[PDB]
Every structure is written in C-alpha cells, then in structure tokens.
Amino acid sequence: SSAIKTTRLAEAIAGIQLYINRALNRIEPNARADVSTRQFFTDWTVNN
Amino acid sequence: HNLSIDGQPLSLAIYAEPTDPKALLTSMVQASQGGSAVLPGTLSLYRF
C-alpha cells in the first residue's frame, strides 16, 4: 500500500539484502559459487 | 497494509462534519391592487 514509507537508502538496503539471500540459498540458478564462499558471506549470520 | 500484528490500523481518519443547513427565512410578500372606481352621481329629492 502507499501507506508504507521508506527512503532510498532503506530501499536499496532491502533490495541488496534480498539479492544476497536469494543467491546464498541456491534458489537462484547459475550461482557463482566460487564467490559465495567469501568471508562476508561466512559471517552472513551477523551481517544480514 | 501497514497494520498491527492483528490488523489494527496505524493511521486514524477524520469525520469532516458538515456545515449543517440554514433555517429558511420568510418575508412579507405584497401584491398591489387598487380600489373601486367612483360611480356617476344621481340626484336626490331632499336637501343638504
């Protein structure tokens, strides 16, 4: 609904988080699994 | 829809009460009309 209110930075955060989460769970095909093993993703539990 | 966890809306509306009607005011309405014409004068048999 239009009642929800956000800022550009908040939206971009949400989108990028969604993209990362989709990537990791292998729901996305053709994942570059080589890069999925990086340290940031290792700490994805506390960097989500 | 940006509600509570149970469906309570977070935003409250207004009633927008009307102006209410106006009491009709009546006025003295007058139509002008004349009086009766004089009649031709016959003469009597007594004195003044």
Automatic annotation (TrEMBL), chain B:
TM spans (from-to): none
Protein name: XptA2 protein
Complete-protein stretch covered: 2003 to 2050 of 2538
Top-rank taxon: Bacteria
